[PDB]
Every structure is written in C-alpha cells, then in structure tokens.
C-alpha cells in the first residue's frame, strides 16, 4: 500500500489505532498487519 | 433432626450452586464484572482482553 | 490556570455531545483510558470533572 501522509499522522496508521484521517480514510484492520515503513519526505512535498 | 445425611447432601448441592452463581460478581481483574458494560464502554481491541 | 493549581469544574445536568468535539481536529492528542472515544456518546455518567 502506497500513499504519502503528514508525519504527525504517521502514528495513526497502526493496527487498531484511531485518528480522523486514519479512521475516515485509511485504517489498518484490528489484527495482523505485515509491516509499516515510513520515511518522512516533507522536502518533496509542497 | 434425625435425617442428617439427606439434609447434608441437599445443603452441599445448594451451596455449590450458590457459590457458582456468586462467582459471577467477581471482576477477575477486569474493569467491571458484568459483560455488557465492558462491551458498552470499550473498543474491541481492549474489550477483548 | 497554572498546572500546580489546576482548575476543576464540575459538569452535571446536561446533554453532552462528545462526538462533535472529538470530530474537531483542533485537539492534537485525544487519549481516553478505560472508555472508548467512539462510544462516549452512548454512555451515561453521574457527573463529569473537567
């Protein structure tokens, strides 16, 4: 799964985690998830 | 009170059933003893534990 | 108020919508312990302390 999100929201992308962007748009299912890799690249953004 | 044995077995069975029913009031380490509460005020991830 | 003299206000006799304040993204961190945020609306409590 590929997407770019603000660094502040990176914690929300976790199994069973709750956040507005997380809950509404993309939330990991409350069970096994393989792995989550995040490297913030805000320089490329904006 | 001649019939001691009979009353003894009756009392023992009633006592076992009563303590089994009473064991439902125990928290056992949960946040509440009744199930509908720990289902009504928690998320499935922690309601599970 | 200052942290050492934290200000406590009692809350009672009202209909309280947690969902709207939770929906607002103004609050950076929202951690509820022992109670689920989504089901906060359904519950009824004796009183609240803020």
């Amino acid at each position: 799964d590929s997407f770019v999100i603000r660094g502040d929201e990176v914690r929300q992308i976790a199994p069973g985690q709750t956040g507005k962007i997380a809950d509404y748009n993309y939330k990991l299912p409350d069970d096994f998830t393989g792995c989550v890799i995040a490297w913030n690249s805000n320089n490329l953004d904006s | 009170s001649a019939l001691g044995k009979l009353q003894d077995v009756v009392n023992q069975n009633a006592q076992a059933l009563n303590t089994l029913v009473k064991q439902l009031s125990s928290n056992f380490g949960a946040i509440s003893s009744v199930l509908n509460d720990i289902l009504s005020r928690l998320d499935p991830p922690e309601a599970e534990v | 108020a200052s942290v050492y003299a934290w200000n406590r206000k009692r809350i009672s006799n009202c209909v309280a919508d947690y969902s709207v304040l939770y929906n607002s993204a103004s609050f950076s961190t929202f951690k509820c312990y022992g109670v689920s945020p989504t089901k906060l609306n359904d519950l009824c409590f004796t009183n609240v302390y803020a």
Side-chain angles (χ1 to χ4, degrees):
Chain A
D1 294 332
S2 192
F3 63 94
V4 62
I5 181 63
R6 297 174 65 191
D8 60 357
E9 205 271 339
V10 72
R11 195 190 83 274
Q12 278 57 229
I13 304 298
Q17 189 61 255
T18 64
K20 196 224 170 172
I21 300 299
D23 192 0
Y24 185 73
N25 317 293
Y26 184 87
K27 55 143 170 163
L28 267 181
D30 289 19
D31 49 0
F32 178 82
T33 289
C35 287
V36 54
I37 290 89
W39 66 98
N40 272 313
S41 278
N42 273 356
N43 45 4
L44 277 294
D45 292 331
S46 87
Chain B
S1 87
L3 298 180
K5 304 212 176 51
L6 277 63
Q7 196 69 25
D8 190 327
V9 313
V10 169
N11 287 329
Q12 281 175 11
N13 270 0
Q15 185 85 37
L17 281 186
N18 274 357
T19 177
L20 189 75
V21 168
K22 182 63 66 68
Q23 281 292 320
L24 289 178
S25 289
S26 279
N27 280 309
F28 290 108
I31 194 59
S32 189
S33 158
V34 68
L35 210 48
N36 292 316
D37 289 8
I38 83 173
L39 283 170
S40 158
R41 63 186 194 84
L42 269 189
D43 282 281
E46 308 79 0
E48 204 88 340
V49 312
Chain C
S2 84
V3 68
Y4 80 94
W6 46 269
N7 187 359
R8 146 172 297 195
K9 176 189 299 321
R10 195 150 300 96
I11 308 192
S12 164
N13 289 318
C14 52
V15 167
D17 183 348
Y18 287 143
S19 87
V20 293
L21 60 88
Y22 176 43
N23 264 27
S24 159
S26 44
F27 310 146
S28 85
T29 81
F30 184 79
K31 268 83 74 173
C32 299
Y33 288 163
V35 171
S36 88
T38 80
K39 313 195 78 167
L40 256 180
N41 195 323
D42 314 328
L43 319 179
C44 279
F45 290 148
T46 75
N47 59 355
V48 195
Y49 294 70

